[PDB]
């Protein structure tokens, strides 16, 4: 599985990212954060949804512990987007469907300052990844 939402938290991302003001550095940190997203097994790539909004291919899938909590997994081809996926995974991992319809899943990106100078297509993939997350909450 991935470290996001357990070992990498919103809190650790705030500490990495709040000091950062230059986009070169935000992007350096996203790329490094992307490298802790493991390679997704082919089994599970075959079962993930392929997100139709991205510059390269992006997978997002999910399971659900019948104890309520929802557990996501994904992969990405490009280094920046892998990092954005990591940030998403951090917001969204370990959450109930109730919890996910409450908050905007992209809220974390706004509070880390990782939207302002995002490429136009990056935003789409993002939005698409949010819409995709919302769908899983409804379907339980």
Q: For each of the domains in the chain, give its residue range(s) and CATH number, in order of start.
A: 1-140 (3.90.1010.10)
Instruction: Look up residue 67 and give its DSSP letter.
Output: T
- 80 SS3 class: helix
Q: What letters, b where the CB count within 10 A reaches 16 and e where it falls short, cover 91-102?
A: bbbbbbbeebee
C-alpha span between 95 and 99 (Å, rounded): 6
**The tokens of 83 are what?**
């990092």
The residue among 46, 49, 43 whose CA lies nearest residue 133 is: 49
Q: Which of 54, 84, 100, 136 is catalytic?
A: 54
Query: Resolution of this entry in Å?
Result: 2.4
Pairing of strands 49-50, 70-76: unpaired
Residue 104 near residue 129, CB atoms below 8 Å: no
Torsion of CA 82, 87, 90, 91, to 10 degrees: -130
C-alpha span between 1 and 32 (Å, rounded): 18
Element holding 72 (H helix, E strand): strand 70-76
C-alpha span between 130 and 2 (Å, rounded): 18
- Please name the method used to determine this structure: X-ray
In the residue annotation, 15 being an active-site residue is answered as no
Task: Name all contacts of 4-8 with Cβ < 8 Å and 24+ positions apart.
Answer: 4/36, 4/37, 4/86, 4/89, 4/90, 4/93, 5/89, 5/90, 5/91, 5/92, 5/93, 5/94, 6/93, 6/94, 8/33, 8/36, 8/86, 8/90
């Amino acid at each position: 599985g991935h470290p996001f939402g357990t070992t990498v938290t919103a809190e650790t991302l705030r500490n990495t990212f709040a000091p950062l003001t230059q986009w070169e550095d935000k992007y350096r940190q996203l790329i490094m954060l992307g490298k802790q997203l493991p390679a997704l097994p082919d089994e599970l790539k075959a079962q993930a949804k392929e997100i139709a909004g991205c510059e390269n291919r992006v997978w997002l899938g999910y399971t659900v512990a019948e104890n309520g909590k929802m557990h996501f997994f994904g992969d990405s081809e490009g280094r920046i987007v892998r990092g954005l996926l990591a940030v998403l995974l951090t917001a969204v991992e370990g959450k109930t469907a109730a919890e996910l319809q409450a908050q905007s899943p992209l809220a974390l990106f706004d509070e880390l300052g990782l939207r302002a100078q995002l490429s136009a297509s990056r935003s789409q993939g993002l939005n698409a990844l949010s819409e995709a997350i919302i769908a899983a909450a409804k379907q339980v």
